[PDB]
Design a protein around this ligand. Structure first.
Ligand SMILES: Clc1ccc(CO[C@@H](Cn2ccnc2)c2ccc(Cl)cc2Cl)cc1
Ligand SMILES: Clc1ccc(CO[C@@H](Cn2ccnc2)c2ccc(Cl)cc2Cl)cc1
Lengths: 589, 589
């Protein structure tokens, strides 16, 4: 409802026009402005629908002569907030900081000011239908514009740093949502120099938000990479540099696991934003995960695939015997016939026993089953789990059949094995493009192919009913006619033909008209097919391939036993360095 | 095991931290550094796990004030090598040459030095898990950094040139592995000016390595082409230049054959490195091999192809008669029936008689059967040789049949003729792309097409077994069902259909679901097919085409008789120039 906000904006700009006693500061009046304030007691009594006063329009643009003489009439006129609903609690300076007019700040500070007044306006929250998000306190509004010395001023009158908004946002992590670099790189250093000077206890960069998240990792998953670059020079310590060779060490007390089950490895694959895929760019991450996948990833990722592919060939093989009397069992083959599914019942309970907790860890299917990188393949994993139970609902009431839902389930079940097809030296990006464009361009012609075939079917059905179903027998009745022309569009079976004394009149030219559409429309599927790989997604299938490896190793580390996983790097102990657990990669120029 | 090297590196950097009596040179201490050396006899006794002493950290970066006063305490402290296993035998200056600090070399040379101490460190050999390879002697370490005058210094104290390492590497050919050009172009001249001054006898550029190879050809097959450019100006001699026309002569006493069976023509097609294909770039090679292929190559490359294509049509034709009694031979047709394979037995012994010596010339199949440019086609040449022998194992025990291995062999045998399909005016790069991408992208869908068809087959088999095999008869049993759906995916034969009183329920919608996968997945093979030729290998199929010609002429020259091959160029004799055998190409500006 942006037009609901647009209801109240133009009310003020001619309400100041209506009453002729207050708007003269907006249009730089001097001589008549010095007349109206002394003859009447009408200085403070002018309030708009917002709660508007004479200083906010004087700081709309800088009215230097307007804010000069009104302190003689009312010096307390600045310290009143606004009262309307979209601008609840917002005062005089709150517009006079984003103007970056340093000649304006000498007046209203020494003549009565209060920096602790926060700005709780309704147009100030983070929202998709609101453009800017600049924070709560005017220190944050000074930090957003990127001015170096006016932010010098308000600190020198007892400014607080640790104050947040109603949704827990401090002064620091509002920089990483804003895309500019050239002012956020320099302002970060001298503002972090003005700490408590007892910095490790009640740390200002370790205090969580209202969600409870350490504000450095917001920059990690929203991926403004220059902060991820710039904080790594505070942790750097050189060891030896010899010519074009140098050494470096890697501190990863935050890049770890068991951090109260809120590590960023859980959450870098959780974002739905497109820039966030390339956070694997710099050396603290990429050579770490490349060692973690080479040392423990590949020699364990294949053995469960082996024990799965021999699981399902056994369940496939044992189900080629189950119809036995459809056209009470004690024989010799009945023992292996029994254990063939007595294995798969305790093998089929585990596929829900391991796949319900990651469902209620997320909380909803709307944040589980949409990710391309996490994998939409779970929709067949969940329906493989129910068939076995259903297979058992038949043997309490003894209904006939119940191998036809098995027929409809076993193919999809067998198709499930290709989710571990990504872990090889190859074959990864081949299965990514198909899942990328089933949703993309297979959807198009499936809404146009069903709508074109049934008119063909009705035109074919209305003609051959004047003759017998014995001479041709292909187009008999309504259900098989649409099926016959639907599969006849795909040039699978040859068109029907007979040569006798009976011959239909209309069928030939409409068959040619069907062929003149089947010779180009099925091939116009191929051009919408082809237009994606050439320029559209040619770069997409490799970065997703190098992101599924960190996805599957973070998903696999949090389920397997501790015995199979130590943490990488070096020990650090026997050396008086503390519990910091460094790491080396070697760089060359 | 790079982490095994990483076990011992950080031990030193805080062991110097632990003992407070030796590390003060590393952190530029002056006043307290002058105290600890006189009160104790503790100057030489500090040794680390490497064998570390006080001068190596003083030459880590340049500690000018540290290496000033320790010669008053121990001037012999520089001439001790290291003792640990990864740094066996490496002394003080060995780090003080790669710093290129010319103010440092005035101290430790005149106060006791020895340039003959080689550096036998374990991190100094050529290895894939080690980054740099800079040589053995500090002359080579001076040559690698590319400094012009500090290499002036150590020559002036009796430096040797002809010394090598344990694997035979002199000072010269360590330049061609390093990719830089702008310092290797100028340093090569004045260092070659400092020869023995009796240069042709015991020549420094003709001394072989430990493998026994003349070090100029390392630059040929590793292909740093600027050395191949720069040495050709020492052999140049102008004759006449008239306007935009000039003449030049070509000395090829090294570009020849019979050079103790170790010519570079054998070995330019042997490398597995990608830059090495474009060594056909400059005029001593390209116009030479273009004359060798035009004069003798094409009028001889076709006649053996003719005598091969009439060989195998005769062997094909004679084998359409051999089953004679499967549903002792003296007739009139038995004479030509006998000689039809009496020709091919002595024609089939030669295909192994000529193709075992190039096997044990290489030594293993791992360096024979992998080359794309040499040709992986030998795998059918080796299996054509065994069928004939097998055909003869039947006629000692008289077993029934043995025309079915002939059936399985004759097609592949007939497919062998296209290895000489490269020698024409055309048709070369057409057969290169297919062999390039059988290994490339035919491998992908062959691991996904077999895994998808058998679930379809089991779903088709589980339904039709409730009915008779008489009404349809297509899906009868397990072995033919997978075969039937495997060839039915390829839209070769039409799908089965019948119209009677019996009609299956589940088959129609799963047939439509098979068709909705067969209409896009077989075409998603074509996009992985298409993505290679457009930008991926469009440049590859012509340079390989102009490299197979030098491959086949060097392979053909070393097998055919001398009568059919003289060497190209001009004679040189009747003229007092010596046995040098020049060549002319003409150049235009
Ligand atoms: Cl009735 C019927 C059921 C399933 C399929 C084909 O399987 C679908 C599964 N699927 C998708 C949406 N609803 C089920 C599939 C999905 C993803 C990939 Cl990568 C590959 C495949 Cl084969 C065809 C007909
Ligand atoms: Cl059982 C069977 C045997 C052979 C073929 C086809 O021949 C293969 C030979 N080949 C390759 C790997 N093992 C044998 C071939 C290889 C290279 C090229 Cl350029 C062209 C071809 Cl046709 C098909 C089935």
């Amino acid at each position: 409802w942006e037009q609901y906000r647009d209801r109240v904006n133009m009310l003020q700009q001619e309400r100041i026009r209506d009453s002729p006693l207050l708007q003269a500061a907006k249009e730089n009046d001097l001589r008549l402005l010095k007349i109206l304030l002394l003859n009447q007691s009408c200085d403070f009594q002018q309030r708009g629908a917002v709660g508007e006063t004479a200083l906010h329009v004087a700081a709309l643009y800088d009215n230097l002569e307007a804010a000069t003489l009104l302190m003689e009439a009312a010096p307390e006129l600045a310290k009143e907030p606004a009262l309307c609903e979209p601008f609840v609690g917002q005062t005089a300076l709150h517009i006079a900081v984003m103007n970056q007019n340093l000649n304006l700040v000498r007046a209203l500070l020494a003549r009565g000011a209060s920096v602790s007044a926060r700005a709780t306006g309704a147009a100030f929250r983070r929202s998709p239908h609101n453009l800017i998000y600049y924070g709560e306190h005017p220190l944050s509004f000074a930090a957003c514009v990127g001015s170096e010395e006016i932010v010098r001023l308000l600190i020198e009158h007892g400014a607080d740093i640790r104050a947040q908004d109603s949704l827990g946002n401090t002064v620091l992590h509002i920089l990483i949502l804003q895309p500019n670099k050239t002012f956020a790189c320099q302002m970060y250093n001298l503002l972090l120099s003005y700490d408590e000077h007892s910095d490790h206890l009640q740390s200002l960069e370790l205090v969580p938000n209202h969600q409870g998240l350490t504000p450095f990792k917001l920059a990690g998953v929203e991926g403004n990479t220059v902060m991820f670059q710039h904080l790594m020079q505070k942790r750097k310590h050189v060891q030896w540099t010899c010519g074009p060779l140098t050494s470096t060490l890697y501190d990863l007390t935050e890049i770890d696991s068991w951090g109260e089950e809120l590590s960023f490895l859980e959450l870098v694959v959780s974002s739905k934003k497109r820039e966030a895929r390339q956070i694997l760019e710099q050396t603290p991450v990429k050579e770490l995960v490349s060692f973690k996948w080479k040392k423990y990833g590949r020699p364990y990722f294949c053995v469960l695939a082996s024990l799965y592919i021999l699981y399902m060939i056994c369940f496939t093989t044992c189900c080629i015997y189950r119809p036995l009397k459809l056209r009470a069992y004690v024989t010799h083959q009945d023992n292996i016939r029994l254990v063939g599914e007595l294995v798969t019942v305790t093998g089929a309970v585990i596929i829900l026993l391991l796949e319900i907790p990651d469902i209620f860890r997320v909380g909803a299917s709307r944040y589980f089953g949409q990710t391309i990188l996490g994998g939409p393949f779970h929709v067949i994993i969940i329906t493989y789990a129910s068939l076995v139970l259903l297979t058992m609902v038949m043997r309490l009431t003894n209904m006939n059949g119940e191998v036809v839902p098995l027929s409809f389930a076993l193919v999809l079940g067998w198709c499930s094995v290709m989710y571990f097809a990504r872990g090889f030296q190859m074959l990864g990006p081949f299965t990514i493009m198909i899942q990328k464009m089933i949703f993309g361009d297979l959807m198009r012609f499936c809404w146009l192919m069903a709508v074109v075939i049934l008119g063909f079917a009705s035109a074919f059905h209305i003609t051959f009913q004047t003759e017998d179903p014995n001479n041709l027998g292909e187009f008999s009745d309504y259900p098989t006619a649409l099926f016959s022309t639907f599969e006849l569009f795909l040039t699978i079976i040859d068109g029907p033909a007979n040569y006798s004394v009976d011959l239909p009149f209309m069928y030939c030219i409409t068959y040619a008209a069907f062929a003149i559409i089947a010779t180009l429309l099925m091939l116009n599927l191929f051009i919408a097919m082809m237009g994606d790989t050439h320029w559209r997604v040619a770069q997409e299938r490799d970065e997703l391939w190098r992101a599924q490896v960190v996805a599957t190793t973070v998903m696999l580390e949090r389920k397997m036993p501790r015995f199979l996983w130590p943490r990488s790097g070096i020990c650090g102990y026997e050396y008086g360095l503390g519990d910091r657990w460094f790491l080396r990669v070697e760089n060359h120029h």
